[PDB]
């Protein structure tokens, strides 16, 4: 959260919507592209505890089905005001009713000869989403570096995922089950990847991660790789070879002629979910431990913050064995950093972190990284 994820954390923290998932945006630049009607496409989900950053497919709706138009955005329900923490910004929100997604569901139906993107997507199993609901701002606003915010920029918005085949329609109602085309689960989840890793050679592992902490230091990188996983894998195929420590990675996967070895491949493209949902200062403070043992603590302690936490949907509060860091606990520690960019606040004296609802899919991937990151290396 550096200068403009904090205004939007207070909108949608004051008036948060118990009907849905309000997600927030996250750059100023990009707003633009998360408009009513808009689309976003979000990779395969191979997990319940996280979902990955929803992408912006730079395409409305209009332009999927058969005549174009959307047709217009309704509901202009004006946020009166909010609380900062000038300091008066008056903000509103705009909603698309399912009177008018039933009727155009009804009206327009699917435009069958798109082949451009609809085909680029499920060739690799990606999730497809509609916006559905948005939170722009009215007031131009100047804010304090200093900077100017003009009317209309969307701080958030709630998405509705559609399936696609024979009949078209939207998902309000987010069944994190259907595809577009507790922690004793969560432990489950990321031991049952963790098994698969421990019957791998021993030098395959430490190329990985040194791979794999190379990658950690640039995204597209890791976008890319997780790109040629997902479409080799629920399509099969072979998969073109790749550059840099995406290509070393890719090369292990790869029988000998580019088709993947699904045993040996889909935990990776596992693990490599459970970094993308992760912050940039945060993945790239992880890199430098991936060689250490300083790993097992960071689980044990992100263990215990998901452990101490249930039930996951009251904003509770944990304490933490500092004594197990060896180091001083403080602003400067790692374990510190990590858990504040995965969007908790902490402090010094006990109850030293407090857990919100917003930071379980962060905090959920932290520990599945450094579950399967420590796998490797015993």
Same mark, same amino acid.
């Given at each position: 959260?550096?200068?403009?994820?904090?205004?939007? *954390?207070?909108?949608?923290?004051?008036?948060?919507?118990?009907?849905?998932?309000?997600?927030?945006?996250?750059?100023?630049?990009?707003? +633009?592209?998360?408009?009513?009607?808009?689309? /976003?496409?979000? *990779?395969?989900?191979?997990?319940?505890?996280?979902?990955?950053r929803y992408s912006c497919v730079n395409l409305s709706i209009k332009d999927i089905?058969?005549?174009?138009?959307?047709?217009?955005?309704?509901?202009?329900?004006?946020?009166?005001?909010?609380?900062?923490?000038?300091?008066?910004?008056?903000?509103?929100?705009?909603?698309?009713?399912?009177?008018?997604? &039933?009727?155009?569901?009804? &009206?327009?139906?699917?435009?069958?000869?798109?082949?451009?993107? =609809?085909?680029?997507?499920?060739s690799r199993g990606d999730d497809l989403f509609v916006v559905t609901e948005v939170?722009?701002?009215?007031?131009?606003?100047?804010?304090?570096?200093?900077? +100017?915010?003009?009317?209309?920029?969307? =701080?958030?918005?709630?998405?509705?995922?559609?399936?696609?085949?024979?009949? $078209?329609?939207?998902?309000?109602?987010?069944? &994190? *089950?259907?595809?577009?085309?507790?922690?004793?689960?969560?432990?489950?989840?990321?031991?049952?990847?963790? %098994?698969?890793?421990?019957?791998?050679?021993?030098?395959?592992?430490?190329?990985?991660?040194?791979?794999?902490?190379? !990658?950690?230091?640039?995204?597209?990188?890791?976008?890319?790789?997780?790109?040629?996983? @997902?479409?080799?894998?629920?399509? @099969?195929?072979?998969?073109?070879?790749?550059?840099?420590?995406?290509?070393? !990675?890719?090369?292990?996967?790869?029988?000998?002629?580019?088709?993947?070895?699904?045993? /040996?491949?889909?935990?990776?493209?596992?693990?490599?979910?459970? /970094?993308?949902?992760?912050?940039?200062?945060?993945?790239? =403070?992880?890199?430098?431990?991936?060689?250490?043992?300083?790993? #097992?603590?960071?689980?044990?302690?992100?263990?215990?913050?998901?452990?101490?936490?249930?039930? $996951?949907?009251?904003? #509770?509060?944990?304490?933490?064995?500092?004594?197990? =860091?060896?180091?001083?606990?403080?602003?400067?520690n790692p374990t510190w950093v990590l858990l504040e960019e995965c969007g908790l606040?902490?402090?010094?004296?006990?109850?030293?972190?407090?857990?919100?609802?917003?930071?379980?899919?962060? +905090?959920?991937? /932290?520990?599945? %990284?450094?579950?399967?990151?420590?796998?490797?290396?015993?």
């Open positions: 959260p550096s200068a403009f994820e904090k205004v939007v *954390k207070n909108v949608i923290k004051e008036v948060s919507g118990s009907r849905g998932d309000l997600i927030p945006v996250d750059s100023l630049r990009n707003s +633009t592209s998360f408009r009513p009607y808009c689309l /976003l496409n979000r *990779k395969f989900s191979s997990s319940r505890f996280w979902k990955p089905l058969e005549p174009s138009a959307v047709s217009d955005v309704v509901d202009g329900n004006i946020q009166g005001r909010v609380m900062l923490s000038s300091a008066s910004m008056n903000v509103c929100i705009l909603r698309v009713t399912q009177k008018t997604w &039933e009727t155009m569901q009804h &009206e327009r139906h699917l435009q069958q000869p798109e082949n451009k993107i =609809l085909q680029q997507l499920r939170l722009q701002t009215k007031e131009e606003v100047q804010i304090t570096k200093m900077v +100017t915010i003009p009317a209309g920029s969307i =701080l958030a918005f709630r998405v509705a995922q559609l399936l696609i085949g024979s009949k $078209w329609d939207i998902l309000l109602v987010s069944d &994190e *089950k259907q595809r577009t085309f507790d922690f004793q689960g969560l432990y489950a989840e990321v031991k049952a990847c963790s %098994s698969e890793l421990e019957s791998l050679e021993m030098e395959l592992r430490q190329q990985i991660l040194v791979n794999i902490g190379k !990658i950690l230091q640039d995204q597209p990188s890791m976008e890319a790789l997780e790109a040629s996983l @997902g479409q080799g894998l629920c399509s @099969g195929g072979q998969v073109e070879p790749l550059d840099g420590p995406a290509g070393c !990675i890719l090369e292990c996967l790869v029988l000998d002629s580019g088709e993947l070895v699904p045993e /040996l491949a889909a935990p990776i493209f596992y693990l490599l979910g459970a /970094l993308a949902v992760l912050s940039e200062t945060q993945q790239q =403070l992880l890199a430098k431990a991936l060689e250490t043992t300083v790993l #097992s603590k960071q689980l044990e302690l992100v263990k215990h913050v998901l452990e101490q936490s249930t039930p $996951w949907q009251e904003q #509770s509060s944990v304490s933490l064995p500092t004594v197990l =860091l060896g180091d001083c606990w403080d602003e400067k606040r902490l402090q010094v004296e006990s109850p030293q972190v407090h857990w919100e609802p917003t930071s379980l899919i962060p +905090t959920s991937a /932290l520990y599945a %990284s450094l579950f399967l990151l420590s796998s490797l290396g015993q």
